[model samples]
Every structure is written in structure tokens, then in C-alpha cells.
Target: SMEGMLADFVSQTSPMIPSIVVHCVNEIEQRGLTETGLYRISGCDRTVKELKEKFLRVKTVPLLSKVDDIHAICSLLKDFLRNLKEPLLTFRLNRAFMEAAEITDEDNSIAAMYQAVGELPQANRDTLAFLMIHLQRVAQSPHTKMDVANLAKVFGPTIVAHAVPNPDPVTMLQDIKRQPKVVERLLSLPLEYWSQFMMVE
Candidate 1:
């Protein structure tokens, strides 16, 4: 079912961002911001699966406090992004994204990356904007041990992936390195970059 895909889900639910994403992010901001290893930590597999099913089937998740494992919600958030039918950054501009990461000048790289972000579909732009702000806040919490670079390393592979994967080991390694660089640059963008994409509702 295309139900879990980003574009499909957004079209069906009519939220500027996915409901699950909003819920997970809000819950984390409410209670998990100071939790160490926030996104890098794994939650109980059973709990993560249960939450995923709830989100996909009935579209109703439990109240934040009732779910003892904040990490499960965090894991579910990443899982949703990873399983999207198309990567958030989208498959269309995969190469250019990686190339932008290679730019040496910080200002030049950020400018190029913002241009790439501008090309994303409105849905992606909206969701990415929302998540970027949330993630930046998460990084601000020293207890979370997730600075901008750490968050980029954790989310890069999920958010900045290719449409079709390459099998060569060397290419795979290069992608591994370049993917996070792009995400790092993205996370480093001025607050103004993400603010422009925020939904006015």
C-alpha cells in the first residue's frame, strides 16, 4: 500500500506534515529532549512495531505519557522516513545533492544546498522544514548528545538517499560519507532557510 509513502499520506490526511511525525516530534519535545542518545538509541522492537501499526492502520496513537518508551516514537519517526516511497530530498536531484556536499566553501555549499532544497516538492519542503526546526531544538539540549553533526549523521542516510542504490562497495562508502555531509550542510542552514517553508496555518 502507498499509504505509508510521504506524498500519498499527505494527500490523504491533508496535513502540511504527517500526523505521526507531528505526534512523535511533539512527544519528544515534551519529554525526551534531554534523554541521552535520543534518535541514535533503539526502542523496544515490539513497541516500535506496535506504534507503526497504529499509525498506519487506525491513524490513532496513544497519549504521549502512556507510551513509556520515547525512543520507540523516535525510532518510528526514522522508520517512516526511511520507508518513504521517495526520499525526502527526492530521487530526482540525488546526484546534485551529493555534488553540493563536495563544495569547499561553507557559504558556497550552503547556498547550493538551499537551492537544491528549494526544488523539493511542497510536501517535502513543508515536512523537512518542520522536522529541521524540531531537530535543531533537539540538538540544543546538551543531554541529548545530538549536536547538528550527530543529528545529520543519524538522519542523513534516511533523508538524503538515492532513488536506486548502487551496489559497488566504493560507491556505497562514498555515498555514506557524502550523504551526511549534505545533511550537515542542511542542518547548518540559517534559521531563515527553514522558516521560509513553514506552513502559515
Candidate 2:
């Protein structure tokens, strides 16, 4: 009985000769007498032609709307990816350092580090603009004499210790200090003199 009822409903709703003829008459009237030139010319064959034209126009509306939705989704995805690129780059660099340190699966540490970076309140986006201008002078000179390894020797361990766990900070610093190349490059300035220089500046 259920199957029979469903079949009956389907058949009743299905397009047929009488329904198509009615639709053509309605369309002609809706378009008005002045605009029914094509229907008038179609004459005996108008029903099928009108039905085809109406069906095509109705189907095209949904298709064009779907295309517009897809374009909007793609635009949103591009912007999302662009915003994520910087954090992803930093994550990869941190992962590389963890790999070098012989630590496998440092996902939690890397996530925590980035989370902390995000949590730190930003002063201003353009806060460093002036500082960057002055720093560019150091970058512009070809004959730069700053002892990079010495700077690394003094500061690299502190950075590594804070950024990555499980590496003994003291031992890491000592190991870096023991390297002949590192020792040769190490330049020591008296603390008092450095303090005085800072105060003067």
C-alpha cells in the first residue's frame, strides 16, 4: 500500500502532456501579449519549446549561485593560509632545532612556544619600525666586524634553553665555549665598561 501510494504521488507530479500545455499557456500570459511573439510564432509547437526554455533558465540560476559560493570559499581559504604562513614557518624552524637536538616528536614543546609567543601582549605592529631603520645601517655595510660567534656564545645558550627543554643549559653553553673556533671569536668586555657604555648611550 505504501509503495502504491508513493508510485501514485510520483506519477501525479510527473510532467505530462496536459501539464506542459498548461505551463506554456501560463508562461505566455506571464510574459504578456506584446512579449509573446516567439510563442505566437511557435504556434502548435510552442509547448515543448517553452518548457525547455523555462527548465534551462530555472536550472541555470542554482548552478551560477553554486559557482559564486565556491569562489567565495576559495578566497576565504587563501586569506586563512596567508595568515597562517608565518606561524607555520616558525613552527618548522623550531621543529628543525628539536630534531638537531635528538629529540623526537616535539609537537607539544613547539606548540607551547608558539602559544606563549601569541599570548605575549603586542605593543604595536609598527613599534619596531623606527628601531629597524637604525638597525638597517648595520645590515647595509659589507665589511661588518661584529663577532657573531662570540655573540652567539654569550646569548645562544640562553635562547636555546628557554626555547627548548631537555638540553642542559650549562653543559650546552660550556660545549659551545670549548670549541676552538668559538674560543678564538670570543671577545670579552669588562662588565663595568659595558655598563658605563650602556649608561652613556
Strongest candidate by TM-score? 1
Segments of candidate 2 deviating more than 4 angstroms:
1-139, 147-153, 157-201
Most accurate candidate by lDDT? 1
Q: What are the per-residue Cα lDDT tens digits for candidate 2 across 92-176?
A: 2433333333323345434443343333212111111111221232223333332334323322332222223333878556534
Q: Name model 1 segments beyond 4 Å from true.
A: 1-4, 11-15, 165-170
lDDT per residue as tens, model 1, 9-124: 67533336887788889999999987988889888999988888887876776665678898988898998898887788888887788888789998888778888888888888
- How far residue 134's Cα lies from its native spot in candidate 2, in Å, is 5.7
Q: How accurate is candidate 2 locally (lDDT)?
A: 0.27
Worst 10 residues of 1 by lDDT: 7-16
Give lDDT for model 1. 0.81
Show the colliding residue pairs in model 2.
Answer: none
Give all TM-scores, in the order shown. Answer: 0.90, 0.19
Give the 10-residue window scoring lowest on summed lDDT in candidate 2.
1-10
What TM-score would candidate 2 get against the native? Answer: 0.19
